[PDB]
Amino acid sequence: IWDKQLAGYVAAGFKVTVLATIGQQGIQLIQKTVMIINLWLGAHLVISGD
Amino acid sequence: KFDFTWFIPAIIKYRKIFIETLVVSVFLQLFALITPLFFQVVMDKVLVHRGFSTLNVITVALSVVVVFEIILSGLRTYIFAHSTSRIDVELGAKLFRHLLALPISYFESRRVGDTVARVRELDQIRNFLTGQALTSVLDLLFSFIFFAVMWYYSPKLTLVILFSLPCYAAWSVFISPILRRRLDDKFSRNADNQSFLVESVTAINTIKAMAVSPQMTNIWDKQLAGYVAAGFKVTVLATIGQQGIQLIQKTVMIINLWLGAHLVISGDLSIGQLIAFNMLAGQIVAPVIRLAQIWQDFQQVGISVTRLGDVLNSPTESYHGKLALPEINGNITFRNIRFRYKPDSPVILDNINLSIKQGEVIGIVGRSGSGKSTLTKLIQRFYIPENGQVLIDGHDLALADPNWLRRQVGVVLQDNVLLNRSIIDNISLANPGMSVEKVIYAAKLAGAHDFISELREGYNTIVGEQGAGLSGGQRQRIAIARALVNNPKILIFDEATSALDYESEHIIMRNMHKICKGRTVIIIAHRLSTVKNADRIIVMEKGKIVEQGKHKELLSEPESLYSYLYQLQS
Amino acid sequence: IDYGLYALEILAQYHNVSVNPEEIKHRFDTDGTGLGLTSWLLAAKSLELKVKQVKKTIDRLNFISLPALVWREDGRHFILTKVSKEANRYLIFDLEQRNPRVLEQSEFEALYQGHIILIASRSSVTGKLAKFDFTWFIPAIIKYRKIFIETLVVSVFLQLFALITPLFFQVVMDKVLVHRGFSTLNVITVALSVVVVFEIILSGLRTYIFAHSTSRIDVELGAKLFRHLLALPISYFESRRVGDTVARVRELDQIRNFLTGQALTSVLDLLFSFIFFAVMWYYSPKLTLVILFSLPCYAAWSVFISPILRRRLDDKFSRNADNQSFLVESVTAINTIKAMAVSPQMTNIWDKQLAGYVAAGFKVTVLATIGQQGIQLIQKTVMIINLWLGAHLVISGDLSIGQLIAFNMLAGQIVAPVIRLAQIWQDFQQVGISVTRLGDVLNSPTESYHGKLALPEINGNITFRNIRFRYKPDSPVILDNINLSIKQGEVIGIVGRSGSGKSTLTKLIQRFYIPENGQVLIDGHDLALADPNWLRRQVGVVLQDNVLLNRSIIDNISLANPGMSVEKVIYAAKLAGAHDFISELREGYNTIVGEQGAGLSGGQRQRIAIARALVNNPKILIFDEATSALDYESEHIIMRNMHKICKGRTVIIIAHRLSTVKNADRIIVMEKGKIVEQGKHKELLSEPESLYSYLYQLQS
Amino acid sequence: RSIIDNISLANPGMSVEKVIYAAKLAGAHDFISELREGYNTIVGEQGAGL
Amino acid sequence: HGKLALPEINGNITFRNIRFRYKPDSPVILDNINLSIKQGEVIGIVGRSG
Amino acid sequence: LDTPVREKDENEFLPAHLELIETPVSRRPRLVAYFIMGFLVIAVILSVL
């Protein structure tokens, strides 16, 4: 009984960890995309002026 | 000894995936290194000279580099968590298997909450392993590529960072042990609180039947205040450590700014090179910052490992594996047994010598303090005699398998403890996949079917607690059914009819010839009317045999103490 | 003998699961004489243990976990345990010759056929209260996730395909016409042909795959709905009408018509329209802003119109359900309608109901039309505004004619799914109504009594303990303090006047009537929460008026187990005295009985019901005034065969006539809900100061 | 329908006097009266309640 | 409901038409128990199990 | 810095005291103002130098 319950608990914990990792990676992706866009626009702004 | 060498075989067993995680980590470090080079290129050859096509090339390369880095980091985290989950599952299975094999003296000397907390330390370890604490350690360890690139850029600022690292090491060394001590205190308070909570919820019937809510509430208030104070101390130390890390980070940042400004002023360093160097220095420090806010996790996993060791380092009454000794025929004999509750306690039995043959229904009587109640706990190897040997079917019980012996022997006590399950789940505890007809037959033998008939839920009725929801006689009948539903070669009745009324006891005694069929039955009871139909009645006085024989053989002579006991009982 | 059942019992015992073979055979061996692979797997999954029939070679048997069942096509299965390569021997639990036995490799190879079933158990399902609603479709979507991911990929590629044509029109207008550029028009034409062919093919494939998966989901929902419906208590059906439940079930067909349609594909096309938005913003933000402001107008119009349409469709469904109930009740009882000559009243009622139904439908149609026209108005207003703004934005440079028409095409492609969604607004609202009315049935306490006790077979020991029963809460009491006890194999008779309460004991033994006070116990087990399939399968009841199904004589007799051999059916018919008139029929057996036994007489259906109750070998047999509709010959045959009928059963004979229970081992006289006298026939008849003597003299 | 509606099925618009007379003639008056709803009791589907 | 502070207890116990069930639908344990016990009174209650 | 939890530290979290104390104040009531004024005076003396 303990082995069955422990296996179920560990599976649930792993699913939670997987979704947390997915969310963190998505937020990192958004941040990095914004960084790239700002780098490109800032390069144009510094080359041009203002 | 289980302190930390236990995880080494687990690591090596899964070496072929851990090496892959290491290689993925170094590739992530390279991917991270790529981007500051692109900023340096933009700052030195795009903003200065000319062109927008090279800027477009840098942007399109950077997009795919970033996407690949994000995917690779997610995959590495997933693989590391998947690999560590198996290790924690193995640890949990081993821990519980060890816990069930511990001797009963271990549990009799402790509280339930202590063991429960020591096993929740397993969950603490699991959360530490299946997290982002070891990945940060890998990121910190694999940062020498950044150091090589920075040394290529400028040696002075790289030396500044290289000297900043021992400051982090020394700060951690200084501020760790006190945090570990505070977390030890916090864990002790947590264990005390858990024990109090379990004890109070288990005995809520007595707390509410009496009127001691204020006492329980006062104890809970004091314990909660102490626990929260300890937690606040731990939080304060963690905050001090984090601020100490930040101080070093910002100090070296300022020093690097000053030295880089003086370097760029004096040539020999471009502005884009300085920006890339600053980004690399920040990427080196980021693992340290991310690891400094999970300091309590490191210290707590150390303490949880220590407590798991405390549970797992005690000796086990586990097994005696030698030739797989065969089944038991109901032959019990005692040879010069003397028993003492504690080495500094009065002696109970002195020279008890006994021999019981197969299929012999023997009754043992006496008064309070006679010592007849310890025979049932001596037959099972729970009580260890001071000197002598207890022989069952010719074989010593001190060298046999405890599980085998206690499986062959069924015992019904004065008060029995069930589980919080259905009646059929308690009767068939030793074999839940067993046929229901056997359960019904055993319940009918014990007379338990009748009172179950007036239950609306039937055999699915859930016993509310250890014995709540059923009366004393009902619990005794359920325990008798549970003992009888197997095929025990030896049955022991240790005042197993005290809680029963006259009708239930009569019903049980009418079925006694079906109960005793082919088994060695030992009946121990205060009343003399239960052993009337026994093949041999034995009288004990202060741990010695004074009389034996049939009931009449003893009732005929008034000189015997058996006659006096029978006269008092009547 | 069935070896799959025994193997399943053994494997469940090994995995600490208690199983009653009779209960599994009842619900998973519908067609008799053999479980079969699919039903075996379903039965194994019923016990909350996972199984899978897998392809394994003999060299791979050393790695599988044991025990495992070896499924042989001959039906002679066996269980494999403890494979050992030390001596190349295989320990096996032989189902036939139940004892285990060891076999070598050579004969294992002869027995093994490359088929094995792996068995394992893992925890159970945590208890929850999941009422039926739209959230029920989330697990179905999760289960069919590969198909839906495929559909999303195809949808995004279709959206990319639809973007190419406006670009090609722009390049044609901007370059081909201006520069007189032949040899470029040809390339655009070929590419456009390829693009349209591929997008047509992909749209067809997406529709095919999505329709298939939604059809499978609807099949699962319908199976669940019927399984729930058959498990409802009889008080549920006693307070409703047939047409109500029939309409509540046809709403499933409505849901099916929705799922295999263009609504969800149109929605998917709608959510994937930002790809066009990026391109049109690249062209000119001034008109993309107009489109982005137009979208909230669509949303607000839809939100404003939806509730009124839902209310109108509620009224329409009420009309439809009442019309269906009236139609079913009038067609079922058409004989009474013809006999009483009440056709004008029925026609008047039908005309009123039909007029109301048509009025509701017309109101729904009008509301849907005004909603569609309201959406058309927004579309065309945005079109006019865009035309004006585009004319100005082309006059002053900054935009070309080809870019303008490409923008117009992109805007049309964006708005078209909204139009096709508006064309099926009634379908959306009706599907909401269908889900709600389906939940009206799927959210109801069933008497299935889920549990894990698995009670054993029945010995005919019946016991009434302080039984008090009222038909309804305000009704007068029917049985006051009935206390009865019947032993196994005891033929018993219950008599009395009408209204005494002897007729409700039959429906108390079965769990059709719930006593107000007291409990009914079979073999010492209280029936209040027992499994109805466990109880009513082993209790045979013959009523004064029984109904049949239009299947055949033999299929009606052996309905409870179609696996009965013809010899047993013939024997059961002979016992009831029904074989004689069955044999002389034109078809003999296999004769259609019609709707509730229309082709058969009223005294023949009674004998058919007696045979049907006898064929299943019940443990308790109840004759609730069975022989009151028969003539003297049929009743005499029944009473002469009663001695063979009563062998090994606990027979209860409730009758008005005292001559039926003369041979009963114990007679019970009841009066106004109380057992006033009980005893043998001679013991009760010898007292002139009793009720049995008065009733015997009066009837004689 | 109700008891009185079923008894007056051949002519739904009929007064309670004729219903009472017919029930007394058929001998059903007493049982219908002993009921709680009297002549308004719903018999169920195909008169299953009786 | 009573927020008032009732005084101390004198040993006057009274059961008035007591009907009790273990569960909402289980068999009735006490049907119509009526009892009255005065202060300072020793009461013995006997019977069979159940 | 590493002193164990004493009774003085434990009484600050006793629920009875928290129930009696109304409108509680922080343990460091004036430190924030002291540090902010110190920052302001250091800034103003750095600006003039």
Side-chain angles (χ1 to χ4, degrees), chain C residues 286-306:
Chain C
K286 200 155 291 299
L287 311 156
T288 315
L289 278 169
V290 185
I291 310 295
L292 294 174
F293 293 147
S294 86
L295 260 64
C297 310
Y298 291 137
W301 188 236
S302 66
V303 166
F304 167 74
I305 298 283
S306 295

PDB file of all heavy atoms in Angstrom, chain C residues 286-306:
ATOM      1  N   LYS C 286      -3.948  52.468 -40.157  1.00  0.00           N
ATOM      2  CA  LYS C 286      -5.160  53.280 -40.093  1.00  0.00           C
ATOM      3  C   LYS C 286      -6.421  52.445 -40.288  1.00  0.00           C
ATOM      4  O   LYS C 286      -7.443  52.719 -39.650  1.00  0.00           O
ATOM      5  CB  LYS C 286      -5.094  54.395 -41.135  1.00  0.00           C
ATOM      6  CG  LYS C 286      -6.030  55.556 -40.859  1.00  0.00           C
ATOM      7  CD  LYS C 286      -5.532  56.832 -41.515  1.00  0.00           C
ATOM      8  CE  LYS C 286      -4.264  57.336 -40.847  1.00  0.00           C
ATOM      9  NZ  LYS C 286      -4.486  57.655 -39.410  1.00  0.00           N
ATOM     10  N   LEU C 287      -6.373  51.437 -41.155  1.00  0.00           N
ATOM     11  CA  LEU C 287      -7.514  50.562 -41.393  1.00  0.00           C
ATOM     12  C   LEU C 287      -7.529  49.344 -40.479  1.00  0.00           C
ATOM     13  O   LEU C 287      -8.609  48.854 -40.118  1.00  0.00           O
ATOM     14  CB  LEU C 287      -7.523  50.102 -42.853  1.00  0.00           C
ATOM     15  CG  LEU C 287      -7.367  51.173 -43.931  1.00  0.00           C
ATOM     16  CD1 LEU C 287      -6.821  50.567 -45.209  1.00  0.00           C
ATOM     17  CD2 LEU C 287      -8.698  51.830 -44.193  1.00  0.00           C
ATOM     18  N   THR C 288      -6.352  48.840 -40.104  1.00  0.00           N
ATOM     19  CA  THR C 288      -6.294  47.794 -39.092  1.00  0.00           C
ATOM     20  C   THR C 288      -6.897  48.272 -37.780  1.00  0.00           C
ATOM     21  O   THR C 288      -7.507  47.482 -37.054  1.00  0.00           O
ATOM     22  CB  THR C 288      -4.850  47.342 -38.884  1.00  0.00           C
ATOM     23  OG1 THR C 288      -4.219  47.164 -40.158  1.00  0.00           O
ATOM     24  CG2 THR C 288      -4.809  46.029 -38.123  1.00  0.00           C
ATOM     25  N   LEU C 289      -6.752  49.562 -37.468  1.00  0.00           N
ATOM     26  CA  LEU C 289      -7.414  50.117 -36.292  1.00  0.00           C
ATOM     27  C   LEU C 289      -8.929  50.054 -36.435  1.00  0.00           C
ATOM     28  O   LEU C 289      -9.638  49.768 -35.463  1.00  0.00           O
ATOM     29  CB  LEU C 289      -6.954  51.555 -36.063  1.00  0.00           C
ATOM     30  CG  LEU C 289      -5.619  51.712 -35.334  1.00  0.00           C
ATOM     31  CD1 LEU C 289      -5.144  53.153 -35.397  1.00  0.00           C
ATOM     32  CD2 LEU C 289      -5.744  51.247 -33.895  1.00  0.00           C
ATOM     33  N   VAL C 290      -9.444  50.317 -37.638  1.00  0.00           N
ATOM     34  CA  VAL C 290     -10.880  50.204 -37.874  1.00  0.00           C
ATOM     35  C   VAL C 290     -11.347  48.773 -37.642  1.00  0.00           C
ATOM     36  O   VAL C 290     -12.392  48.537 -37.027  1.00  0.00           O
ATOM     37  CB  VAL C 290     -11.230  50.689 -39.294  1.00  0.00           C
ATOM     38  CG1 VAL C 290     -12.733  50.681 -39.501  1.00  0.00           C
ATOM     39  CG2 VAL C 290     -10.665  52.076 -39.534  1.00  0.00           C
ATOM     40  N   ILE C 291     -10.580  47.797 -38.129  1.00  0.00           N
ATOM     41  CA  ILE C 291     -10.957  46.393 -37.940  1.00  0.00           C
ATOM     42  C   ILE C 291     -10.927  46.021 -36.457  1.00  0.00           C
ATOM     43  O   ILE C 291     -11.831  45.342 -35.940  1.00  0.00           O
ATOM     44  CB  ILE C 291     -10.044  45.473 -38.770  1.00  0.00           C
ATOM     45  CG1 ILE C 291      -9.971  45.958 -40.218  1.00  0.00           C
ATOM     46  CG2 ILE C 291     -10.543  44.040 -38.716  1.00  0.00           C
ATOM     47  CD1 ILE C 291     -11.283  45.875 -40.955  1.00  0.00           C
ATOM     48  N   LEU C 292      -9.869  46.443 -35.755  1.00  0.00           N
ATOM     49  CA  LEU C 292      -9.740  46.164 -34.330  1.00  0.00           C
ATOM     50  C   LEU C 292     -10.826  46.833 -33.506  1.00  0.00           C
ATOM     51  O   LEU C 292     -11.169  46.323 -32.436  1.00  0.00           O
ATOM     52  CB  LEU C 292      -8.367  46.604 -33.821  1.00  0.00           C
ATOM     53  CG  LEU C 292      -7.146  45.855 -34.351  1.00  0.00           C
ATOM     54  CD1 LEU C 292      -5.869  46.508 -33.859  1.00  0.00           C
ATOM     55  CD2 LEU C 292      -7.203  44.411 -33.897  1.00  0.00           C
ATOM     56  N   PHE C 293     -11.346  47.976 -33.950  1.00  0.00           N
ATOM     57  CA  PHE C 293     -12.501  48.569 -33.290  1.00  0.00           C
ATOM     58  C   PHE C 293     -13.800  47.879 -33.675  1.00  0.00           C
ATOM     59  O   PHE C 293     -14.741  47.863 -32.875  1.00  0.00           O
ATOM     60  CB  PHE C 293     -12.590  50.061 -33.615  1.00  0.00           C
ATOM     61  CG  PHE C 293     -11.475  50.876 -33.027  1.00  0.00           C
ATOM     62  CD1 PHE C 293     -10.994  51.994 -33.687  1.00  0.00           C
ATOM     63  CD2 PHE C 293     -10.901  50.520 -31.818  1.00  0.00           C
ATOM     64  CE1 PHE C 293      -9.968  52.744 -33.151  1.00  0.00           C
ATOM     65  CE2 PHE C 293      -9.873  51.267 -31.276  1.00  0.00           C
ATOM     66  CZ  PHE C 293      -9.406  52.379 -31.944  1.00  0.00           C
ATOM     67  N   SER C 294     -13.871  47.316 -34.882  1.00  0.00           N
ATOM     68  CA  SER C 294     -15.061  46.600 -35.322  1.00  0.00           C
ATOM     69  C   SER C 294     -15.285  45.327 -34.522  1.00  0.00           C
ATOM     70  O   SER C 294     -16.431  44.975 -34.223  1.00  0.00           O
ATOM     71  CB  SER C 294     -14.949  46.263 -36.807  1.00  0.00           C
ATOM     72  OG  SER C 294     -14.258  45.042 -36.999  1.00  0.00           O
ATOM     73  N   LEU C 295     -14.209  44.611 -34.197  1.00  0.00           N
ATOM     74  CA  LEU C 295     -14.353  43.341 -33.478  1.00  0.00           C
ATOM     75  C   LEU C 295     -15.136  43.457 -32.168  1.00  0.00           C
ATOM     76  O   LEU C 295     -16.008  42.603 -31.922  1.00  0.00           O
ATOM     77  CB  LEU C 295     -12.964  42.725 -33.252  1.00  0.00           C
ATOM     78  CG  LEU C 295     -12.551  41.606 -34.208  1.00  0.00           C
ATOM     79  CD1 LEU C 295     -12.446  42.122 -35.631  1.00  0.00           C
ATOM     80  CD2 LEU C 295     -11.237  40.992 -33.762  1.00  0.00           C
ATOM     81  N   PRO C 296     -14.892  44.444 -31.295  1.00  0.00           N
ATOM     82  CA  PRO C 296     -15.748  44.584 -30.104  1.00  0.00           C
ATOM     83  C   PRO C 296     -17.212  44.790 -30.430  1.00  0.00           C
ATOM     84  O   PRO C 296     -18.062  44.392 -29.629  1.00  0.00           O
ATOM     85  CB  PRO C 296     -15.174  45.807 -29.374  1.00  0.00           C
ATOM     86  CG  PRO C 296     -13.942  46.188 -30.066  1.00  0.00           C
ATOM     87  CD  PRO C 296     -13.678  45.271 -31.202  1.00  0.00           C
ATOM     88  N   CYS C 297     -17.543  45.414 -31.563  1.00  0.00           N
ATOM     89  CA  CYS C 297     -18.947  45.534 -31.944  1.00  0.00           C
ATOM     90  C   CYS C 297     -19.563  44.164 -32.201  1.00  0.00           C
ATOM     91  O   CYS C 297     -20.689  43.893 -31.767  1.00  0.00           O
ATOM     92  CB  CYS C 297     -19.086  46.430 -33.174  1.00  0.00           C
ATOM     93  SG  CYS C 297     -18.221  48.010 -33.041  1.00  0.00           S
ATOM     94  N   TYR C 298     -18.834  43.284 -32.894  1.00  0.00           N
ATOM     95  CA  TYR C 298     -19.300  41.915 -33.083  1.00  0.00           C
ATOM     96  C   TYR C 298     -19.501  41.223 -31.744  1.00  0.00           C
ATOM     97  O   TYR C 298     -20.526  40.566 -31.515  1.00  0.00           O
ATOM     98  CB  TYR C 298     -18.301  41.128 -33.931  1.00  0.00           C
ATOM     99  CG  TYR C 298     -18.210  41.550 -35.376  1.00  0.00           C
ATOM    100  CD1 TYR C 298     -16.978  41.678 -35.999  1.00  0.00           C
ATOM    101  CD2 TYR C 298     -19.350  41.809 -36.120  1.00  0.00           C
ATOM    102  CE1 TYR C 298     -16.882  42.058 -37.319  1.00  0.00           C
ATOM    103  CE2 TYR C 298     -19.263  42.190 -37.444  1.00  0.00           C
ATOM    104  CZ  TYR C 298     -18.027  42.313 -38.037  1.00  0.00           C
ATOM    105  OH  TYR C 298     -17.930  42.691 -39.353  1.00  0.00           O
ATOM    106  N   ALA C 299     -18.522  41.359 -30.844  1.00  0.00           N
ATOM    107  CA  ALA C 299     -18.626  40.697 -29.548  1.00  0.00           C
ATOM    108  C   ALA C 299     -19.826  41.205 -28.756  1.00  0.00           C
ATOM    109  O   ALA C 299     -20.574  40.414 -28.172  1.00  0.00           O
ATOM    110  CB  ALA C 299     -17.337  40.894 -28.753  1.00  0.00           C
ATOM    111  N   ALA C 300     -20.029  42.524 -28.734  1.00  0.00           N
ATOM    112  CA  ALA C 300     -21.142  43.101 -27.990  1.00  0.00           C
ATOM    113  C   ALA C 300     -22.481  42.686 -28.581  1.00  0.00           C
ATOM    114  O   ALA C 300     -23.421  42.378 -27.839  1.00  0.00           O
ATOM    115  CB  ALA C 300     -21.018  44.624 -27.958  1.00  0.00           C
ATOM    116  N   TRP C 301     -22.593  42.672 -29.912  1.00  0.00           N
ATOM    117  CA  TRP C 301     -23.836  42.242 -30.540  1.00  0.00           C
ATOM    118  C   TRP C 301     -24.142  40.787 -30.209  1.00  0.00           C
ATOM    119  O   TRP C 301     -25.285  40.444 -29.873  1.00  0.00           O
ATOM    120  CB  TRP C 301     -23.750  42.448 -32.053  1.00  0.00           C
ATOM    121  CG  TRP C 301     -25.036  42.223 -32.788  1.00  0.00           C
ATOM    122  CD1 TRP C 301     -25.245  41.355 -33.817  1.00  0.00           C
ATOM    123  CD2 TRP C 301     -26.284  42.893 -32.568  1.00  0.00           C
ATOM    124  NE1 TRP C 301     -26.547  41.432 -34.245  1.00  0.00           N
ATOM    125  CE2 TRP C 301     -27.205  42.370 -33.495  1.00  0.00           C
ATOM    126  CE3 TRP C 301     -26.712  43.879 -31.676  1.00  0.00           C
ATOM    127  CZ2 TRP C 301     -28.529  42.798 -33.555  1.00  0.00           C
ATOM    128  CZ3 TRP C 301     -28.026  44.304 -31.737  1.00  0.00           C
ATOM    129  CH2 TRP C 301     -28.918  43.764 -32.669  1.00  0.00           C
ATOM    130  N   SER C 302     -23.131  39.917 -30.282  1.00  0.00           N
ATOM    131  CA  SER C 302     -23.348  38.510 -29.963  1.00  0.00           C
ATOM    132  C   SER C 302     -23.758  38.333 -28.506  1.00  0.00           C
ATOM    133  O   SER C 302     -24.673  37.560 -28.194  1.00  0.00           O
ATOM    134  CB  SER C 302     -22.088  37.702 -30.272  1.00  0.00           C
ATOM    135  OG  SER C 302     -21.022  38.074 -29.418  1.00  0.00           O
ATOM    136  N   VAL C 303     -23.088  39.046 -27.598  1.00  0.00           N
ATOM    137  CA  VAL C 303     -23.404  38.936 -26.176  1.00  0.00           C
ATOM    138  C   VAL C 303     -24.810  39.442 -25.893  1.00  0.00           C
ATOM    139  O   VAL C 303     -25.525  38.876 -25.058  1.00  0.00           O
ATOM    140  CB  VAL C 303     -22.347  39.685 -25.340  1.00  0.00           C
ATOM    141  CG1 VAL C 303     -22.822  39.871 -23.908  1.00  0.00           C
ATOM    142  CG2 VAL C 303     -21.029  38.931 -25.361  1.00  0.00           C
ATOM    143  N   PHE C 304     -25.234  40.503 -26.578  1.00  0.00           N
ATOM    144  CA  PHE C 304     -26.579  41.027 -26.369  1.00  0.00           C
ATOM    145  C   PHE C 304     -27.644  40.079 -26.905  1.00  0.00           C
ATOM    146  O   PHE C 304     -28.695  39.907 -26.277  1.00  0.00           O
ATOM    147  CB  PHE C 304     -26.710  42.402 -27.023  1.00  0.00           C
ATOM    148  CG  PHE C 304     -28.125  42.887 -27.139  1.00  0.00           C
ATOM    149  CD1 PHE C 304     -28.809  43.340 -26.025  1.00  0.00           C
ATOM    150  CD2 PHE C 304     -28.771  42.895 -28.363  1.00  0.00           C
ATOM    151  CE1 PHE C 304     -30.111  43.789 -26.128  1.00  0.00           C
ATOM    152  CE2 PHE C 304     -30.072  43.342 -28.472  1.00  0.00           C
ATOM    153  CZ  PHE C 304     -30.743  43.789 -27.354  1.00  0.00           C
ATOM    154  N   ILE C 305     -27.396  39.450 -28.059  1.00  0.00           N
ATOM    155  CA  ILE C 305     -28.420  38.618 -28.691  1.00  0.00           C
ATOM    156  C   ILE C 305     -28.512  37.213 -28.104  1.00  0.00           C
ATOM    157  O   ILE C 305     -29.611  36.636 -28.083  1.00  0.00           O
ATOM    158  CB  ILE C 305     -28.181  38.550 -30.214  1.00  0.00           C
ATOM    159  CG1 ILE C 305     -28.286  39.946 -30.826  1.00  0.00           C
ATOM    160  CG2 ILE C 305     -29.176  37.623 -30.894  1.00  0.00           C
ATOM    161  CD1 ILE C 305     -29.707  40.437 -30.980  1.00  0.00           C
ATOM    162  N   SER C 306     -27.411  36.652 -27.596  1.00  0.00           N
ATOM    163  CA  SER C 306     -27.403  35.253 -27.170  1.00  0.00           C
ATOM    164  C   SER C 306     -28.437  34.896 -26.098  1.00  0.00           C
ATOM    165  O   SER C 306     -29.136  33.886 -26.255  1.00  0.00           O
ATOM    166  CB  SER C 306     -26.003  34.868 -26.685  1.00  0.00           C
ATOM    167  OG  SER C 306     -25.066  34.919 -27.746  1.00  0.00           O
TER     168      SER C 306
END
